[PDB]
Symmetry: C2
């Protein structure tokens, strides 16, 4: 009976970064809550975007998506012209990985947060 419920994502432009993630992932538009702009995903966790007082240090947020959703999100990445890579080290641009019997790709948010989607989880 222990779940991760939310975490804060620091941003330069709080509203733009929240809209960016929700748009690319195909989620509902974010909602204001306290000082945050909240992006909700399906396993009962939300990402609370907060505006930046200081240097934004990039974090890593990876999402398990359906096979069809993978194609749609990948299409939006190319549609916006976002650089992307097969690997967390960004040594293989313009490729996807096929780790763990699934498919996965990495890209960056407006502040350089490392974003990643995958279709089959490690282990599970």
């Amino acid at each position: 009976a222990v779940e991760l419920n939310h975490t804060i994502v620091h941003a330069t432009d709080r509203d733009a970064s929240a809209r960016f993630l929700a748009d690319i992932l195909g989620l509902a538009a974010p909602k204001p809550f306290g000082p945050f702009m909240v992006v909700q995903v399906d396993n009962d966790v939300s990402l609370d975007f907060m505006g930046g007082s200081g240097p934004v240090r990039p974090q890593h947020y990876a999402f398990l998506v359906g096979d069809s959703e993978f194609d749609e999100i990948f299409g939006r990445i190319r549609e916006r012209g976002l650089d992307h890579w097969a690997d967390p080290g960004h040594r293989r641009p313009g490729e996807i990985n096929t780790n763990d019997g699934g498919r996965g790709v990495y890209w960056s948010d407006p502040d350089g947060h490392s974003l990643e989607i995958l279709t089959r989880p490690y282990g599970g």
Copy 2:
């Protein structure tokens, strides 16, 4: 929607001590090594990958929804370790809990200063 948060990296100086600290206090299974990370798993299919070698860590915030009984057990372990704790994210109200959303909640800090929090009733859901 078919979109879930699957994992995120938790930066630490001492990867293993930070991982053991979170799993022990939260009452989770012992962490597992995965590449350079020590992974802590929670029940809604998200894993927290702790990585070592981050100098001064930039504090992040991780809040956990727990059952009513688990709240008492996790709060009991916080008190038993003698950890400072607060009702509010601003750490202005020490040694008390909040009752946000009709529930119960408390804040504390991990070995590197990450803002940790448990709550029993979420807004909306």
